[PDB]
Symmetry: C5
Subunit: 305 residues, 5 copies
């Protein structure tokens, strides 16, 4: 079957709509794709037919070749209904389960908001040009729409389509945006708190002179920090980009090094009989370490938010 012919030179407007049935660090969505276009070749008089509307099969009529852009593979398509109104207006409906192929911006994790994108595309034919449109009454989401650890803020579409030329033929692109924000509250007692306790347990080598107990304090807590980093391996990003957590983790690895330097220096001074000077440093460190940490954290929080 060929596409419907133009009354005049005008292109075929396909009224699209996505409504999230079920939505569920990667994302998959189960939804309704609704398509509507006018094919007069199908028009009928209800009187001769004895039907308000005629229900067709996908094979029977011309259906626009609507493809998705960023998704895993050929969509799990299931046609729900095909309805033609006496005028030849085609009301298509399909149910599709699809994997969201968008990278997340981990730069502000775990205090971030993401915008998941769903791209609808149609390539225009030799016969006539096809353009995409949005039926706002056919764009939404159910309420059973859950995404554990996230707050589903919106499901909206950029109404104005992206029309552009590709391999000498025109293409019409549409942008569906699932905007989500994170449920950060558990991060404190699970990730930052114990990581901070381990670093604090190290800092008690600023009220000690025993190099044996001090080596054992700083070094043994370096092992505990690394093991805890492996414990929360999942909840920490794979990112090749600068991240808020990444720098905070890095800063900690540096603070374990500075603490070793102080400890080492202090012991060297004591061996060297400048104990008044060493005890001065170990005394300063009791306020230096927690103050530079709290400043550097505030510096970073500003640098990332």
């Amino acid at each position: 079957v060929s596409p419907p012919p133009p009354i005049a030179d005008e292109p075929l407007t396909v009224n699209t709509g996505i409504y999230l049935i079920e939505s569920y660090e990667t994302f998959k969505v189960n939804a309704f794709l609704s398509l509507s276009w006018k094919d007069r070749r199908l028009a009928f008089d209800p009187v001769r037919s004895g039907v308000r509307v005629k229900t067709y099969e996908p094979e029977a009529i011309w259906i626009p070749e609507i493809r998705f852009v960023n998704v895993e593979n050929a969509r799990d398509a299931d046609v729900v209904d095909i309805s033609v109104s006496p005028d030849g207006t085609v009301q298509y409906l399909e149910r599709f389960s699809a994997r969201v192929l968008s990278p997340l911006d981990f730069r502000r994790y775990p205090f971030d908001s993401q915008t998941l994108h769903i791209y609808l595309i149609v390539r225009s034919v030799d016969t006539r040009n096809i353009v995409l449109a949005v039926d706002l009454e056919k764009v939404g989401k159910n309420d059973d729409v859950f995404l554990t650890g996230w707050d589903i803020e919106s499901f909206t579409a950029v109404v104005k389509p992206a029309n552009f030329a590709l391999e000498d033929r025109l293409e019409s692109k549409l942008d569906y945006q699932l905007r989500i924000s994170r449920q950060y509250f558990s991060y404190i007692p699970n990730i930052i708190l114990p990581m901070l306790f381990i670093l604090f347990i190290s800092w008690t080598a600023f009220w000690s002179t025993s190099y044996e107990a001090n080596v054992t304090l700083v070094v043994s807590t370096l092992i505990a920090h690394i093991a805890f980093n492996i414990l929360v391996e999942c909840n920490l990003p794979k990112t090749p980009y600068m991240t808020y957590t990444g720098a905070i983790i890095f800063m900690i690895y540096l603070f374990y090094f500075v603490a070793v330097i102080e400890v080492t220096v202090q012991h060297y001074l004591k061996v060297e009989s400048q104990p008044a000077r060493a005890a001065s440093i170990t005394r300063a460190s009791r306020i230096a370490f927690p103050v530079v940490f709290l400043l550097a954290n505030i510096i970073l929080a500003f640098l990332f938010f």
Copy 2:
């Protein structure tokens, strides 16, 4: 084929039923029988002239309602078992389907939790007539070989009254099938809480010691052992982005290792400062402070979560 026409204005009632064959796979898989029954007078026959009790049809041959599932992975691996039409026109459909339950678990009470797995059946009404779902209670159940290791399958029931609502200007009829399960917690004690408690107790022996070298080594080295044990039971400890009864216990333990370091640090600091009467007072208190605050805080939490 079009849907059957109404006698009067009434909608088409589809008598549904799910019967669990098997269950498997902290995620869940179902293998079951989906039974559907509706009246199509167009298919009706006079039993006497026809001779035969009922006639067997093919899915393509007749009109079958478009019944879809809601919380399942992808398009069901459908297999039609039998299609039977009663003299009066009522159709007896049966299919075998294997599906994955897309229902989240509530880990807030892990490992003393009961879970309600959901299977939603939906039907969209057509232009011709309206379709509504019903439940044949004789056709809703589960086999007895229905096992779910580490869980107790309590019930498989359906919320008989459907959720009828309008979506995209057309009516929809949703049905709720509930697989209620509770966990088999008894192994948790000797595998998860007991050794975690032993590690914390082994730390507390720094309350009958004055050696800061042995005390640093006691508290710090056990912190490493607790973290490594947490990695040993990584699977058995929930991922939840929400607070949990086990969630808090673990946190409380990380806090108790910190307080224990503070005491140990204070004790040795007083010792150096030559106030041993005071130091030995604290270390003596700690021998009863630490186990008492733990047992209280645990009881506080158990109440806060149950």
Copy 3:
């Protein structure tokens, strides 16, 4: 196509058989031949006029009984090999199917266990006539290239008498195919129990020492080594929620690291308190207490599990 009609009121006997080609991938997948044989007189012929001894049909061409499997992960990868009709109308069906065995293992005796893997064949009887399953013992077996690494494939047999029962008002016939595999335990000793025992023994050398610094470092540091080794053999140590032979030994070991800490703590506490005669008495007893209670408790458990 409808099922063949009864000579009298008798049901249709379907002669089944499964023959193992290959087994693979603590879960198992099985690829084999499903042979089915039944009498359909509607297709019977006279050899003389036909000439041919037997004719070949296509699955679509004739009525084939709807044989389904019960405990299989995904709708069987179906491949029809051959369909043959003998002069008297006796159909000889053959298909090749690859299937995932869905049977849980009884880990109550790992790694000295014997499992019994199940394959269930089911047929639902139709309105026309009743169907019952049978077993052709000449068509039930396994190849010799049948390997299951770390297991000894003892048998492949079928419970000849089928389990007839009613379901959703219609009659059903179930068959039991049993793959009996026992373990290849010998490598367990040098890989799992031996080093775990060495770590526990390395701890016990704190019974010939008085240095609380060296004793804390001996018991505590080996606790970390035991946990790390438990993570090293994470795959071999079962996920089971139930009582297990290995799972108790692991528990008992976590307890022995606690008792040892207690002795070590008591020993130094008496030494500090100046009852050295008494402390050296305990540390001396422990040199025979610890290895004796271990060897007794192990024998107690081995009896409790075997």
Copy 4:
């Protein structure tokens, strides 16, 4: 259907083209495969025919059997359009999602550029010979082409096909090259820096005489290095061949051994009462260890770059 016949003895030239839609330590690509060949059995006079171009179905006409060489399994094929121009010029277009089966060269990780390969092949038939060609206007990539942690430099094709015989029949291969380079900057604060801090924390046993504190310094940091190696397990290559990073990691394991030897020698001299000699070594080591490291690193950097 058989292939089109030759005017004379010449082979059938198939004008190929791949244009990347999607790209997503393994790689998968979603793109447009464009094919063009002349079948005059389909050719028509535009004037009498009326229509500019006739749209056919894949089954209807003869389409060359174009296969990919290094890809996972039978391609996710989806025919977009088939157009026959008046001259019989078949303009084919399909959308294919495919997994790239090319091994990476980790020798220079994380400072490496990679050339991903897509091989198009056609086997010539008994009737006539088939050869591949490249329409340069139909080879490219979109701009939404992302590969997180990589910089997509080019998508080009080796225009000259590699013609050769296989099993007595002639074959025509084409080389599509997706040249990418890595986004290395996060490697420093995540992989090399803490690994260096752990090794430095060890070296502080060159300003200490306490064998207890020295064993605890060298040995305990060896554990921390191993645990950190497990923390970055993902970001460290599996190569059976030698590598720049793999060599460094090895050199570090050796430096922890040398440091143990010094520490052991120092205390052995101390017990043996040659403290002049012991303090000489520990003094040398303060400059030996950091100098040999910085030299050996420069030696390796040159040996790999």
Copy 5:
């Protein structure tokens, strides 16, 4: 369609051949399955027919049911070409991607050679008997055939088929062997070397008298060996059967135990005021431990090679 009839009582010989296009601790392969048999019912006089050969469709003619034995699931089949020669000889060609289902024998890892299997089977029919044959011109492998960390030595077939009875009907099995050997070099600097360094770092407790430093030396390195074993978890066998590497690992766990015993005894003797003896065996241990290791290793190497 039925099989071709016998001239006399002879069986149908099917000339098979597999040619590896692409190979990729588990293995998959992309190849060409070539089949050739004589079906006279298809024979033609070349002169009157004009054409040298005629191309058929799989559905059109009788093709032998050739199945594979050790592969995951039903082969991703794709028919390339079907050609009939004037005498009725059928030249079939298909492209199949398939996962090798053969167990690896790790009893010599990482100095092992492995023989990957591909079995071809055909079940004989009631009409006539079918037997498999090998066209040696149609058995091979491409040269771009790579298997990272392995050396592809051969791809050969056991020409003589295994003919046997199954469920009362005859069957014909063929053996295709992809013989590969390992690229072990990197094993030394990645697995055995650091494992040896950790064990050597332990042995420095034979030049020490400090029981605190000796407990910390032997015990702390035991943790480092276990953590390193977890670091190389991937590169080490899962085998339920004895391994050369498996016993070495075991022997090492035993050497850490012996080292604890000697340490413990030595301290015990010194406490007991018999320093003459403790010093004596500790001196023995300096040569006992490295000698028994080097002997036991040689014993094992012989026991496994």
